[PDB]
Amino acid sequence: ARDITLLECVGKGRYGEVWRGSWQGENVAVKIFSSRDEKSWFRETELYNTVMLRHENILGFIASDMTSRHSSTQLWLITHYHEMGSLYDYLQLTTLDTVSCLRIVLSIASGLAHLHIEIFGGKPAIAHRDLKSKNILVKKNGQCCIADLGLAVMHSQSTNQLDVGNNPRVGTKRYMAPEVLDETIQVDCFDSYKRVDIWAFGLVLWEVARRMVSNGIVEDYKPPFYDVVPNDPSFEDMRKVVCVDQQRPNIPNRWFSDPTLTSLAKLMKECWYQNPSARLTALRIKKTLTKID
Amino acid sequence: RTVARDITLLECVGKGRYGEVWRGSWQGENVAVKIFSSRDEKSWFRETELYNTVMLRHENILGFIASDMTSRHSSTQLWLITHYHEMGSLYDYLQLTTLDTVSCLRIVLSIASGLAHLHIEIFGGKPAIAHRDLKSKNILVKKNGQCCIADLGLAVMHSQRVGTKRYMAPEVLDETIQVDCFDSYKRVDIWAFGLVLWEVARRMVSNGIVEDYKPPFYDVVPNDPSFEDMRKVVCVDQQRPNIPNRWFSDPTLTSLAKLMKECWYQNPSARLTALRIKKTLTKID
Numbered sequence: 001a002r003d004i005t006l007l008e009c010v011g012k013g014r015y016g017e018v019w020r021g022s023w024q025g026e027n028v029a030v031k032i033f034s035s036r037d038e039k040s041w042f043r044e045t046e047l048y049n050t051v052m053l054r055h056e057n058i059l060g061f062i063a064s065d066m067t068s069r070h071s072s073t074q075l076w077l078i079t080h081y082h083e084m085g086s087l088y089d090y091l092q093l094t095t096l097d098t099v100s101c102l103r104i105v106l107s108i109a110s111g112l113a114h115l116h117i118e119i120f121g122g123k124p125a126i127a128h129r130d131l132k133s134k135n136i137l138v139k140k141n142g143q144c145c146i147a148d149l150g151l152a153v154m155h156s157q158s159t160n161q162l163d164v165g166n167n168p169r170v171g172t173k174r175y176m177a178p179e180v181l182d183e184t185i186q187v188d189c190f191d192s193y194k195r196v197d198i199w200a201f202g203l204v205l206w207e208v209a210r211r212m213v214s215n216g217i218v219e220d221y222k223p224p225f226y227d228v229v230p231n232d233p234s235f236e237d238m239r240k241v242v243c244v245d246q247q248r249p250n251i252p253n254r255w256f257s258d259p260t261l262t263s264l265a266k267l268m269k270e271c272w273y274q275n276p277s278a279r280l281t282a283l284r285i286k287k288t289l290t291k292i293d
Numbered sequence: 294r295t296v297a298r299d300i301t302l303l304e305c306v307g308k309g310r311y312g313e314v315w316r317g318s319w320q321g322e323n324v325a326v327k328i329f330s331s332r333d334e335k336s337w338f339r340e341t342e343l344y345n346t347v348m349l350r351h352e353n354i355l356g357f358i359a360s361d362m363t364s365r366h367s368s369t370q371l372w373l374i375t376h377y378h379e380m381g382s383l384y385d386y387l388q389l390t391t392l393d394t395v396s397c398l399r400i401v402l403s404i405a406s407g408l409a410h411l412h413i414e415i416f417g418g419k420p421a422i423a424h425r426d427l428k429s430k431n432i433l434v435k436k437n438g439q440c441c442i443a444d445l446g447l448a449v450m451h452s453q454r455v456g457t458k459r460y461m462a463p464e465v466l467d468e469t470i471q472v473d474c475f476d477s478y479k480r481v482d483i484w485a486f487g488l489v490l491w492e493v494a495r496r497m498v499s500n501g502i503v504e505d506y507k508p509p510f511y512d513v514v515p516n517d518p519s520f521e522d523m524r525k526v527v528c529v530d531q532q533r534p535n536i537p538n539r540w541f542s543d544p545t546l547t548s549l550a551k552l553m554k555e556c557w558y559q560n561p562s563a564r565l566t567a568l569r570i571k572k573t574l575t576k577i578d
């Protein structure tokens with residue numbers, strides 16, 4: 001029972017398109033890649049070949065296909081479907097209580113620690129390189145899963161092998177770490193890519209915490225750096241604010257009246273050091289969030 | 294819209310260390326489905342990366358349809374789907390069939406055509422490609438009498454010891470191959486082409502005479518030769534396949550003997566190019 005029916009488009013952009021489809025009488029998500037992003041399709045396919053990748057907080061794949069007749073090629077990725085959409089979509093619409101806020105951020109930390117930590121026997125260590133709220137899906141149990149492994153990079157400690165792949169694509173400009181924006185990142189060092197993920201995770205923590213109510217107050221949804229860069233920021237716009245101006249997202253002062261938001265502000269600042277080796281690990285973030293409340 | 298992905302697997306036409314090849318049916322049409330073993334996973338990734346880079350389309354290259362990866366409970370299933378050629382491999386065909394002058398030339402010119410197409414860089418186009426496992430089992434026979442080259446699971450691309458041991462060039466066996474020079478890999482293919490040309494020419498009738506099908510070096514190495522077995526024959530003793538006297542009574546086989554010796558020089562840079570083999574073959578008969 002391999003057939004799929006495409007039912008409605010739930011996303012269109014430079015990446016291609018995502019469809020809600022029907023397969024074996026279940027909803028599936030079907031991504032059809034743009035020609036411009038063919039190397040992302042292949043990288044994501046290499047990543048999903050890892051059976052031990054599977055995790056409650058990683059988007060589950062069903063199949064990957066490259067199809068062709070004559071001169072045209074289609075590139076397909078079929079995954080589980082999350083009708084609540086991305087965390088970006090969800091935060092526009094909804095405020096959070098303490099329980100819901102911690103459940104979301106701990107689930108992302110759990111997914112990211114699962115990616116970063118090598119499993120021996122297995123799964124290589126994996127750095128994502130494009131973590132952001134559009135690449136996180138919300139599940140009906142109030143946990144999230146991380147999506148889009150097209151830029152990922154794999155490392156095996158046992159065999160001393162680093163696979164950075166071949167993909168000219170770069171991460172989403174708004175979420176790029178200082179060392180990415182100033183292009184000084186150590187490209188032959190696996191730990192460099194984990195540290196880029198931690199920066200981006202800090203930004204996602206900020207986006208989420210803004211939406212958690214405390215003392216009758218909440219902030220409106222805003223993307224990171226909304227106050228300091230143009231609407232559709234360029235690479236150089238982001239380099240200006242992050243590297244030249246040393247800007248970091250502002251902590252609303254109302255957070256300091258709430259113990260949970262005070263803990264989260266501390267945690268996001270430890271993701272944002274210009275010095276990448278100073279930043280927390282995904283495991284330490286997971287352990288910290290496990291303890292918070 | 295409905296995306297019909299069901300393929301009916303009808304009969305197994307190949308089983309090996311690589312996995313299995315099945316004749317299958319998609320929407321009424323024969324396809325060939327290669328199901329990869331864990332042993333041979335990297336061949337699916339390499340061929341898939343190549344076709345993701347350049348969608349080869351040539352009458353003498355096995356026609357790509359799809360690369361499929363399906364998640365299972367405890368494994369990943371990897372399928373390559375191509376055109377189906379019911380006559381099977383050249384290896385199979387030659388066991389079962391003698392050739393006349395026209396069929397022999399049509400087979401070898403079609404192989405040279407496929408191989409030159411792989412080897413050529415085309416600008417605007419395709420990268421240059423070396424096959425790295427050319428042999429009679431990796432060539433399929435079409436109903437029109439032409440062949441197509443199959444299995445790009447070891448192929449290497451360029452823009453400006455993985456092969457079958459019996460078909461390895463001397464520079465592969467003695468580890469002198471200039472691994473930094475893409476032309477090295479083209480020259481390894483040409484050596485193998487020359488062995489295939491010998492396998493085919495043996496089955497061409499002249500003056501009521503034909504040789505039995507044998508694989509290259511059948512008379513000097515064991516049924517399943519070691520790397521060392523091949524090195525001693527090809528590198529140390531510098532043996533080459535036997536050219537039977539009866540060929541020198543036939544103008545076509547005399548010309549094909551000359552061509553196969555210009556594929557078997559010890560010095561890789563002395564060997565003919567695929568394009569020069571094509572031109573030579575179009576002037577025979």
Ligand SMILES: COc1cc(-c2cncc(-c3ccc(C4CCN(C)CC4)cc3)c2C)cc(OC)c1OC
Nearest residue numbers: 066067068069070072073319320322324357358359
């Ligand atoms: C994978 O292989 C096979 C696929 C198909 C197949 C099925 N539906 C649609 C298509 C198709 C339609 C249209 C376009 C283009 C046309 C021009 N452009 C402006 C827009 C899009 C591309 C593709 C195909 C090719 C048929 C096959 O056999 C008949 C295949 O071979 C087994």
Ligand SMILES: COc1cc(-c2cncc(-c3ccc(C4CCN(C)CC4)cc3)c2C)cc(OC)c1OC
Nearest residue numbers: 010018029030031079081082085086089135147148
């Ligand atoms: C990020 O990356 C991938 C995501 C998905 C995916 C999986 N479930 C659900 C979705 C979704 C559904 C619906 C909406 C709503 C949002 C608000 N509303 C106004 C419009 C529609 C949003 C999102 C998606 C996009 C699949 C992918 O591959 C198949 C992804 O690529 C790896």
Ligand SMILES: COc1cc(-c2cncc(-c3ccc(C4CCN(C)CC4)cc3)c2C)cc(OC)c1OC
Nearest residue numbers: 065067074076295296297298319358359360361374
């Ligand atoms: C995913 O998997 C398999 C798919 C197929 C297959 C079946 N029907 C139709 C198609 C098709 C082709 C092309 C378009 C175009 C339409 C125009 N526009 C520019 C976007 C895209 C749409 C649909 C395909 C590709 C066959 C398979 O096996 C033979 C598949 O499994 C390997």
Ligand SMILES: COc1cc(-c2cncc(-c3ccc(C4CCN(C)CC4)cc3)c2C)cc(OC)c1OC
Nearest residue numbers: 306314325326327373375377378381430431443444
């Ligand atoms: C070398 O490589 C690949 C080859 C093929 C492939 C393509 N058409 C047809 C075939 C085939 C059909 C039928 C017979 C036999 C049946 C019994 N009878 C007594 C003689 C004939 C043999 C062979 C194959 C094996 C597909 C592949 O991948 C999908 C290959 O791998 C790239």
